[PDB]
From a paper:
pmcAquaporins (AQPs) are integral membrane proteins facilitating the flux of water (orthodox AQPs) and/or small neutral solutes such as glycerol, arsenite, and urea (aquaglyceroporins) across the lipid bilayer of cells. The human genome encodes four aquaglyceroporins AQP3, AQP7, AQP9, and AQP10 and recently AQP7 was identified as a novel regulator of breast cancer. The model shows the typical AQP fold with six transmembrane segments and two half helices located on loop B and loop E. Furthermore, the conserved aromatic/arginine selectivity filter (ar/R) and NPA-motifs (NAA and NPS in AQP7), characteristics of the AQP family, are clear in the model.
Here, we report the single-particle cryo-EM structure of human AQP7 at 3.2 Å overall resolution in complex with the specific AQP7 inhibitor Z433927330 (4). As seen for AQP7g, the AQP7 with inhibitor (hereafter called AQP7i) adopts an octameric configuration with individual glycerol channels forming two adhering tetramers, which interact via their extracellular C loops. An unambiguous inhibitor density is observed in the glycerol channel, showing an extended shape with the kinked end exposed to the intracellular side. The inhibitor fits into the glycerol channel of AQP7 by binding near the ar/R filter (composed of Phe74, Tyr223, and Arg229) and extends to the endofacial side of the pore. The ethyl-benzoate group is accommodated in the wider pore area in the vicinity of the NPA motifs (Asn94 and Asn226). Further toward the intracellular side of the pore, the ligand forms two hydrogen bonds via its urea NH groups to the carbonyl oxygens of His92 and Ala91, situated on loop B. Closest to the cytoplasmic side of the pore, the phenyl pyrazole group is accommodated, and the nitrogen of the pyrazole ring hydrogen bonds to the side chain of Gln183, which likely positively affects the specificity and affinity of the compound. In particular, two residues located at the intracellular vestibule of AQP7i, Arg106, and Phe187, display significant shifts in comparison with the AQP7g structure, resulting in a wider channel at the intracellular side to accommodate the inhibitor. The Phe187 side chain rotates approximately 90° to avoid steric clashes with the inhibitor and instead it forms a CH–π interaction between its phenyl ring and the carbon atom of the pyrazole ring of the inhibitor. Permeation analysis revealed no water permeation when the inhibitor was bound to AQP7.
Author numbering:
A (entry chain A), B (entry chain C), C (entry chain B), D (entry chain D), E (entry chain F), F (entry chain G), ...: 26 to 278
């Protein structure tokens, strides 16, 4: 038990658990929306994926701040708030948590997925089920506009997160920040979601895609949409950095 | 009035009242969803059954902690937080409250039930009404996968309820814990509900089934779904124990 | 301005304004649900009529407690919390506020009502519009069962209101009671609403009916449903008294 | 950086950013409702446009109070709370923020707008898209009744926003005012929205209309509905002034 | 084989076979309309029950004229066209054919009926299946108005049958009368069908009702609708007699 | 019985009966389409109103030719085929038959009309029932365009009826002309019907309107649609005359 | 060209062409019903099959009688009407015609099939397309009941075909038999079709199944439904023989 | 009037009138299907466009045979049945008739077209109206497959027309050929219509396209779908020639 005494292990485990819980809730809501129409709705996805973040923040608040997203960690490290030493640990914890959450969601809804798909797993089609785990580019939307959407959404998320938590300007009452963050995520999903699925998280996107690829959806997951997989990994970092810079320069003294 | 002075009677009455109120709200929402399509929706069931737990916590907060679920009481007693002496009292109070709540819900919606069913009470069918009181296994889902779903959902519920209330790590602001618990139950219902009805409560499941059996739905309530009735009584205990152990070992110092 | 200095006038004006605001919001939500199907839903009615109570409590909190319901005032006066001297003043304020709110709602949605009804105002029918202002008994539901439903709902409301506000047992955090009361009203509407429209308020029911009768819907508003109008005036008083007695005897020490 | 030290520049930038964020969220929700029916609903618009005001208040709370609406600023200046010197600065900041938010929303949803409209931009019609940015008068509703609706809604908004914030009577708990304000806006949209789109904000209305006019929707945006554009600029000022006067005279000592 | 040489036996067998075929087609169309909505429509029932008469006329044209209806036989016998000696033979043949056709239709659609009803056979209800074999009075329609409808429809049918076949006035081209009669029945069903199911045939109505009663639908088939069963047995006789009298007196020289 | 010997009385009775039967079938189909959506469709109206003409032609073929339409009689008289002496007799017979058919249709569907309308008879509205008997101008269509539509449709009907019956060019096989005429009316209704209801018959239009006016629909039947009632009385005469002239000049030698 | 002079070659070619045309029309109607919901309906399939049989009868009437079905040929040969020498020639012609018709239908609707199925050909599933060519047993219906349905339908078809064509009893007018046969097939499809797809033709069933098997739907076409493929090959022969025997013994002298 | 005596003028006028009537009926049915969904269906289009051909055949039967299609005329002239001298006259008559029919249909449905399109005429889009007059290639279907479909459909039409009319083999009863031809066209539309709109007529396709181009739909009518306009002008000629050759060689002695 001597390993668990170190603070690095604690900051790894807290991130792992919080990301796992949030991803489980989000993927469950998405599966409900996709598979069964009677029990699913877009507002259900928004509520689940917004108030799962709240539970993750509650779980891993003091230990590591509950980043739960690699773009937020990159933005914090670039601004000097968090040293670069802890970046790989947070990234590994988030990736492992998301991968295990995707595995759990696949395990729970196995029979429903088989019944809906008819036994054949298709990435794209009328009965496609690969969109539950990772986001895919719609038909009308293009690649670079998707890049713009991802970067812009991540920028707004980072600016709002800076505004809510900042103690100098107008912080939320302590102990109620999780509800405000959850409502922020909910309204982000409601208002700016249909264009690209509002990924704005490399941890939410890549590990589920890898899990589907090794589970059996095939190599079409990467090559679909003119190699769309790398956009959610690149755009959010720049978006979050720009949003933090804008907030700090303008409103943050 | 000398009987009411004893603390055991108080801890019995508080549990009885809180469980009664929560079960009344939940069963009313379920009946609204089942009977009338215009006035019912899945989100309505989630909201009612999540924010009735908030009222129950408010009613029976200080006296006994408002366990309102036999799985939570078993998990607390196994970890030494609550002595084993008070377990039967809590179980009896919860069972009586749930039974009376089911009776009240049956009394209120009698004419609507008769009109919808046409006068014949059927456990399974196009106009089945036995699913209002207790959960039943869907067609595609099997028994052991239902056991897994129940155990996993109860484990997640226990882990989240332990994280929210824990004073050392990151407790919610006192006086606002009921809202957070209600939102947790709402998102659990939204995200992980369609597989088995998210029973995760022996008190919510068994007494309504017994009430239907003695009211006249017949003995088909127990034998349906390869004797499904015992799964919600066994799985949540193990799920809650495992969730509490995991949280205590990893995150709770 | 010497009249406004007296406390009686202030406690009358506060009740008038709070009841007016709450009734305006509730009737607007009901009109949205009834007239236009695209912009209306049952959940919209529940949210509007639940969180209008919150705004009324905020407006008239300290001056008079924001009873906004004759049943609550009668229950408080019968238990000795409020002297009988202030009962007529509160009743008159609530009645005037509700009547003016009904008049305002009629004034705002005049063209939409005329377009939907085709120019003819009918109490009952496929294009009936008299149900916006007052509740009417459904076809399957009978008179005495409606009396039972009204009394039971008012009793549950009074018990929950006692539980939430009581300082000794487990009060909500001060400054956040309005949100909890609004959520309570929302879940009451969601869970126990389709049977009779969850009137549980003489002030919400009678003055709008009188306004419709003098506006031109005819005398059919009173005689419809075997003289249903007197049930919402009688049942809630007994329901609230019984709920308060039960809470005080069992849980409130 | 010497310019940013002055308080006037700070009060300009805070208003600009808060109005920009709120308008972005509101227009995104409206576009979701209009373009795609599966991902859009009226409740989504209400939630987005209500809880965007919460984030705006959080962003620009201490610096300038987050007026975010010219009617509120005019009402405050007329009552002497805010000097007339700061009115033009606030108005310019709000106008610029709203114009840039409309431009951003147009940039993000360009392909979806082209696909839905078929390539032709029409102010009025079965595939009209000019209603995303600015509100337009419905067919049954007339001009002066729209004026009445706008003034009345702004009056109720001002009275409630004067109640939730007043420290003497019954203020909300500090740090939680943003949630209550957001819920107020949500219920306003739910209850009193279908008549005219509940503009009640010159900044929310005029700059998007100007942006559409210069973007290419034509000059039909102004002349439509018997020159409806000037009503949202005139009615809210009188409505807010009357609401503030009523609250101050009656309930505010 | 000496029995089959007699003309009475031949005129009995022809009626039996023709009535059997027509009833089989009609009941099959009705079952398609009732059970499966995708494969059923009112126009399908009209076409089947109209062009089954054509096939029956083709089968039993020369031997006995293909009366296939006790009302037509009674009308012909009362006018002296057919002697009273052959009335019981025709009635017995029609009754036996209709009973066997109902038995065959019950045998073919057994599994579909069990699946649709859930295993319980109900005369009236949301999943009622007793209406496939015999007609039942709707909720809004009364007994004596049903008598009037039946008599009037039978009178119109008899007048049109007299007009089509009459050689003196304007007979249809020989060999094509069956198509015209089928189209007449189709348009009768289309134009005057929703009030009472356009029974206008004792042979089409009573034997299926008796078959359901002995098969297990219970004694509710006779007592339903204020003893509706005797109206289709009495009204068509008077209707057909009056129609024939009117045609002969006015148009038929 | 000496009166019935005269040929004038015979032709009068034949026209009366044929028009009565055709109008009964057409109005029954229209009532089915209007009142009940499950049992009604536009194709049902077309088939009923097309193959009722066939039955009328069969009934009154040799005696008078079964004009059943004042426009056809006027066109025949203007061309010298029929002397002007018999025009008033035919017109009176058609008018009386149509009036009695409207009365019969009103008598049969009385309860259904009362249930659908809620007890109030409205010429125009969401539950209007005056359109069953007579045609009314739609909202988008204007008066003179309706005149053009009526005249053009009557012209095409006259040209086709002249071509079908003409013995010199290419007559249909005798005894099958009724089916061809019915199919012609059906396709006219299918192809050119939604603009004005394809009245093209003064006898089909005016007497039902008069019957509704005296039955209680009020004087709004005449004044509706800028006095639309006179167009179906004037346009078909000119249309039929022009069609007959065109056919005779160009194709009929 | 000396080969074409022989009567055997002519009786082969006529059967080939008629079966080809009828199968093409039927499969086109089925594909329209299955693929596109807007352009497809069950009544369309019924009309296509019936009036394609009509066209086949017109094409191959005098040369060979247009059997177009192996059951009819077997029934005729067993009764001595057709010698056994011509049975193999007719069977081969029908099989070749049906196979080529299936190939043509596959060639025409290739892109639509690929678009609907998403590129994957599945025998059973939500996007199954193997049912266009051959009939498959529904879920509720069993094997032996399907055998009974097929035999009974073929018996009724044979009895009606004997009745229509028989010159002694009541033949249809020569030159109009094709319309009557088409209407018979249409009403058979309307009344007795949903149970098993009313195959009642080995030539209509087996060759399309073989074509799908060699085209790429796999070997699941034969093994599906407990080896359902042999029922349409065996049942119709017995059904047709029994129907012919019954008609000849009872009605056919 | 000396011009009308010549047989060439008669063969021009008969073709003109018959084509005009058939095109009017077909375009009216198509407009009903496209504009109003309540009054339009695919089966309506099939019935109208099939039984308009019947009326055209009746009108112009003896004078010129009622070719009404340039493909049929070319096929007849190539086989020597009709001399090449009369080909240009028939083509000109058909073209003029179709152009005037398109003009008439545009004149009748002007207000409905403007209301549906919103005032803007678009060839392709959600509110496109250019498809009423001429057929356009669907999205999934390609150019050469459309050529194949057109040629194949015209071939089947020509083969069936040869079979129906041929006196030696099995002609339809004289005077009833029009009904059989109409049913043939109806089933062609039902079975093989959704791929390309079953143009199979240059006269039905090109003149309406030219009329739309000069009326104001723009030059996009020709360039749409990779210059689709020339396929309906080329494919039907080859299809009809091949069908006639096949019928003459194989079945026609």
């Amino acid at each position: 038990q001597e390993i668990l005494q170190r603070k690095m292990v604690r900051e790894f485990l807290a991130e792992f658990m919080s990301t796992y819980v949030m991803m489980v809730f989000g993927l469950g809501s998405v599966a409900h929306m996709v598979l069964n129409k009677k029990y699913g709705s877009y507002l259900g996805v928004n509520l689940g994926f917004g108030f799962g973040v709240t539970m993750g923040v509650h779980v891993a608040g003091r230990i590591s701040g509950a980043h739960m997203n690699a773009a937020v960690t990159f933005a914090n490290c670039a601004l000097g708030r968090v040293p670069w030493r802890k970046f790989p640990v947070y990234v590994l914890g988030q990736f492992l948590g998301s991968f295990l959450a995707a595995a759990t969601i696949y395990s729970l809804f196995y029979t429903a997925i088989l019944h809906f798909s008819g036994g054949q797993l298709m990435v794209t089609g009328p009965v496609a089920t690969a969109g539950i785990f990772a986001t895919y580019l719609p038909d009308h939307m293009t690649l670079w506009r998707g890049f713009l959407n991802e970067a812009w959404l991540t920028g707004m998320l980072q600016l709002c997160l800076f505004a809510i938590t900042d103690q100098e300007n107008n912080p939320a009452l302590p102990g109620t920040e999780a509800l405000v963050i959850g409502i922020l995520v909910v309204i982000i999903g409601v208002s700016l979601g249909m264009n690209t699925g509002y990924a704005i998280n490399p941890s939410r996107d890549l590990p589920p895609r890898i899990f589907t690829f090794i589970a059996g959806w095939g190599k079409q997951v990467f090559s679909n949409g003119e190699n769309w997989w790398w956009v959610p990994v690149v755009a959010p970092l720049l978006g979050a950095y720009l949003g933090g810079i804008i907030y700090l320069v303008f409103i943050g003294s």
